[PDB]
Amino acid sequence: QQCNGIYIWKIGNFGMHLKCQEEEKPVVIHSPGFYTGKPGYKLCMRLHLQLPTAQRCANYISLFVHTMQGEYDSHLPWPFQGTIRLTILDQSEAPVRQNHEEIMDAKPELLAFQRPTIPRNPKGFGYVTFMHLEALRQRTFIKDDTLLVRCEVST
Amino acid sequence: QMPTEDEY
């Protein structure tokens, strides 16, 4: 049996978010808090649609992971060590599909991987330039006005 | 590239 916890983050009303970005309105959305297992760590993701004029990350989708205080925290090791696979799923036709993803190794020396003293860790870990918005028109990443972001954690 | 720590 597999051991990794996998969360599927459904971001709906995406067309609206894209419209805002195109009108130079900031877009930053947090995923609901989710667990990597039972017992497991509690995390949430933070996704940005950077402004079209954003210096150093114009028109880019940014994606980060943040640790949160979870109910199983007393039974887990700290700081967190392991890998986190972030994927924006291709919802294209039956034939071969090509998702957009990155895999990151946790850096135990960073505060992002410690348990926060408040519900959501201020410090997160991720990619400022995860995927360019232009990539969204290259494949069917948006389906039924929804974007699918997959987060797989391996301890 | 490599991921980075980012504060929000």
Give Cα A109 distance to the centre of its chain.
21
Kind and range of the H or E element at B7? strand B4-7
- Best of A125, A129, A130 to substitute, by most chain B Cβ atoms within 10 angstroms, is A125
Q: Which two tokens stand for residue A142?
A: 């948006």
Interface contact B6-A123, CB threshold 8 A: yes
The residue among A46, A127, A131, A132 with the most chain B CBs within 10 A of its CB, best to mutate, is A127
Encoded amino acid at A24, one letter: E
In whole angstroms, give the CA distance from residue A124 to residue B4.
8
Question: What's this structure's resolution in Å?
Answer: 2.4
Q: Which own/partner pairs from A70-76 qualify as long-range (CB within 8 Å, at least 24 positions apart)?
A: A70/A35, A70/A40, A70/A41, A70/A42, A71/A42, A72/A35, A72/A38, A72/A39, A72/A40, A72/A41, A72/A42, A73/A41, A73/A42, A73/A115, A75/A39, A76/A39, A76/A40, A76/A41
Of B3, B7, B8, the CB nearest to A104: B3
Q: Which domains does chain A have, with CATH numbers?
A: 1-155 (2.60.210.10)
Phi, psi (deg, nearest 5) at residue A137: -100, 0
- Does A127 contact B1 at a Cβ distance shorter than 8 Å? yes
Residue A41 CB-density burial (10 A; 0-12 exposed, 13-18 middle, 19+ buried): buried
Q: How was this structure determined?
A: X-ray
Q: What is the amino acid identity at position A120?
A: R
B8 with A129: Cβ contact below 8 A: no
**Core vs surface per residue A49-59: b (16+ CB within 10 A) or e:** bbbeebeebeb
